[PDB]
Design a protein around this ligand. Structure first.
Ligand code: NAD
Ligand code: NAD
Ligand code: NA
Ligand code: NA
Ligand code: NA
Ligand code: NA
Lengths: 253, 251, 253, 251
């Protein structure tokens, strides 16, 4: 019933090597998209691309924090494939700590990819997206919709992405480029599967669905936000969090 | 066939977004129960859908007695309830100083009590199917209007009831979410003047009122497996309206 | 430095017998206000009133859920004292449970005082407030800014108060009546001091300040919102919660 | 004497809301440190206040080296820091397609980095006094603008940094909050045309731009003992702007 939903659409995915990035690549690919799997590292995106239909997936190296590199990537993709239809700004760096536990370097690391990456990839994709009346889906976070204990820089950066999603949706929605985010809770990885049962129980107590988000469940929302069914959704920061942000913060008794 | 043999109960199904939801869910294989107090209108919609896959209920969802009976009779007759769309709603325009106690009672009865009652009496049945609720809230539940004070109170209640019930029941397999439209082309707004409708085109970044089908599309998505990790969300379907900080355009 | 801030202003306080109501009465009284202590029960408001300066405090019986009684109370107060300057809509009923654990009666009990009380007291005070360019402070709740586990009706009612505060502030702010709320976390009572250390520790873990709100701390915000210092604050739902609603819901690790 | 002998560090203190805060805190007995990159302006404000109770620092708060030195020198010289107002800010108008990488760097440097750096290097000193932070965010950090994309990203970062740092440090006795103004009568907006300013009067329910003193009043309140249980709050000082759901007036 979703067969062909993204037939011959060009989807650029940044952070394509991470768990949400791979799940996105596979979901959009299954619905007919041509995927561009953009990431810093080579092995993960190459492996995913080689698993997808011949001629329908390509991998690129990018540092999304480098505006010159990003401009050149977006123009080459549009040149090589004739079009860009969807940008998934899914690159992400996290560092744990308060501002007293994290360095200027930690700030530059988080800000460069999590903020600058969204600004640069959106600014340089937009001329292509305007031609196709395509869209942008930002990977924001639960951590951009309110604060965390012990991730101050990360919360600042994801806060920037949530409000930039709003501002850009106002600037470009009326010219036919819808701009939205997904705000996932912590996604099931092995950088989460590796946590002790004490720690994974504390996360699950706070989520009414009582488990972590699967990456496929976040990908499903990204695909929906890029679909014609989302024609009137613009500037939205969609919580994909099992209820996490629906709480006023009071404990579950 | 996304909703093949799923029983979908839709309040306010005789017109507008409820009708559009009936047609969308019915197209995807649902059996639709169409609840409305507009008897002629909801009968016509039910009769337009595939034989044996649509039934109309003449009901005022403000009436807990009538709501409890409907949800139990539907469950008995069709053996299940999978989806509840709490969509039925009325609007009145004005500040509290320009709208009566009776106006308040009508707004609260349909827009707050209808949602509470329908949720409360559908829930035992949705728990059996790991079904879901989609509330029709509004942009006017996420923030205030000039000149719809009672409506804003009601839709405000719907937005936060969505969150609380999502925490209560999500763990037992019942997702509860809302859609929050801005202006939609329906009977609710077809009497509003061009002066006000034109300013909605300025305040909505997409530059137009929504079609009722564009909101039905999101109701279908929220009831779908692709929304399996969306719970307690008040989804704006507003073209950007609530994304604005309230400021006019800076340039 | 606050001496005289509310000199000869008439402050109507509903739920004047509860802990926030008494703390409000005392705070506004100390700054020169004439207080009207409106509540269902007699003993508490009589005791507070008798503790305050002669001629500067009166107690009334009211059911804020009764629109006829409320209209008559507001007109008699304005008639007797010549003016109303401030309305504190501080009446409150709570019942614990999901919608499956709470009855239609429980819904009518919560809705009548927590919603209807704010609508009725605001509608009937407003003609008086317009004459003095006074204001309204609603006692909303943390529970009106997001959901709780096990208080579904309460969250619906406080949600209504938070958004009604917004709508009314838009309707009346420009005519000189500012309308705001306070959104307290659970306030220290003996209906909280009576809870076991297991249960009070769970509440405190979720509040960065690591303790419950004192009623005086909520009263201080109500007085600020009614002051000339709050001249540009309108339609605001002020969290008085030690950080509770600043959290995205993630656990503290 | 609410701030008698309290050391209050105020960035952007040479003009507008920072200047108004300097005068308000100084009136209530504070010793004010006035940090600004506009040397003439901040010197004039400092010289206008009581002798021995005001000092100007010529600084670009985007520069972490300069910020760390200032906070340590202030603490050494005056023996304490009680309050930090992260107020310094710049604005640029346009979408990302109409504003340059350099524009972004200038906005991010002052509006995001300045706040991060000033907070980070003031904090050890505020922990000693159980002091507080008040950030100047904006209505444009709580929602989006048409035509201020970079500014909205920056103020968005400030709003959520306020929340995270409030959770990190509130327990150690350091409250962190923000004020979120709509239009204020300052150098920042004195170049904006009447067409845009008049529409702010429509979108602000109070019907006027704020005086800078009306925001300084709230900064003083948030640094006061009366705000002892307010933490991680982004307080709108906007006359109702963000209370709106985005809709134009219904009647
Ligand atoms: N149209 C908009 O601009 C807009 C915007 C946001 C939200 N909404 C919400 O959308 C929902 C649907 O409204 P619509 O715009 O499609 O208008 P509509 O008038 O086309 O349809 C509403 C339907 O609800 C029915 N209904 C009303 N009260 C009822 C009751 N007591 N019992 C049973 N049925 C009842 C009506 O008869 C009607 O068929 C409402 O909850 C409304 O508040 C409307
Ligand atoms: N004026 C408004 O409408 C409005 C609305 C909401 C928020 N704000 C915020 O209010 C704050 C104060 O701005 P204002 O309106 O009073 O404008 P202003 O121009 O009157 O004052 C801002 C001051 O900050 C100083 N400053 C700027 N960059 C600096 C830097 N790198 N280092 C040190 N000092 C620096 C400037 O020299 C100036 O003195 C800003 O953060 C602004 O974003 C303004
Ligand atoms: Na998760
Ligand atoms: Na109509
Ligand atoms: Na508390
Ligand atoms: Na200027």
């Amino acid at each position: 019933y979703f067969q062909g939903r993204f037939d011959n659409k060009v989807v650029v995915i940044t952070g394509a090597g991470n768990g949400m990035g791979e799940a996105a690549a596979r979901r959009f690919s299954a619905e007919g998209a041509i995927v561009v799997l953009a990431d810093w590292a080579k092995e993960a995106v190459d492996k995913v691309a080689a698993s997808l239909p011949k001629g329908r997936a390509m991998a690129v190296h990018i540092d999304v924090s480098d505006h010159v590199a990003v401009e050149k990537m977006m123009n080459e993709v549009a040149e090589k494939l004739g079009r860009i239809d969807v940008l998934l700004n899914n690159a992400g760096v996290h560092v744990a700590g308060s501002v007293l536990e994290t360095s200027i370097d930690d700030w530059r690391r988080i800000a460069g990819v999590d903020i600058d990456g969204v600004v640069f990839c959106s600014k340089f994709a937009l001329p292509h997206l305007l031609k196709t009346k395509g869209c942008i889906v930002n990977t924001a976070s639960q951590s951009g919709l309110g604060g965390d204990w012990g991730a101050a820089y990360y919360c600042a950066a994801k806060g920037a992405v949530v409000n930039l999603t709003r501002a850009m949706a106002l600037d470009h929605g009326g010219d036919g480029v819808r701009i939205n985010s997904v705000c996932p809770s912590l996604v099931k990885t092995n950088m989460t599967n590796g946590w002790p049962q004490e720690i994974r129980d504390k996360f699950n107590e706070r989520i009414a669905l009582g488990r972590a988000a699967e990456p496929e469940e976040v990908a499903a929302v990204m695909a929906f936000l890029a679909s014609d069914d989302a024609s009137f959704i613009n500037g939205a920061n969609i919580p994909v969090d099992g209820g996490a942000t629906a709480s006023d913060g009071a404990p579950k008794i």
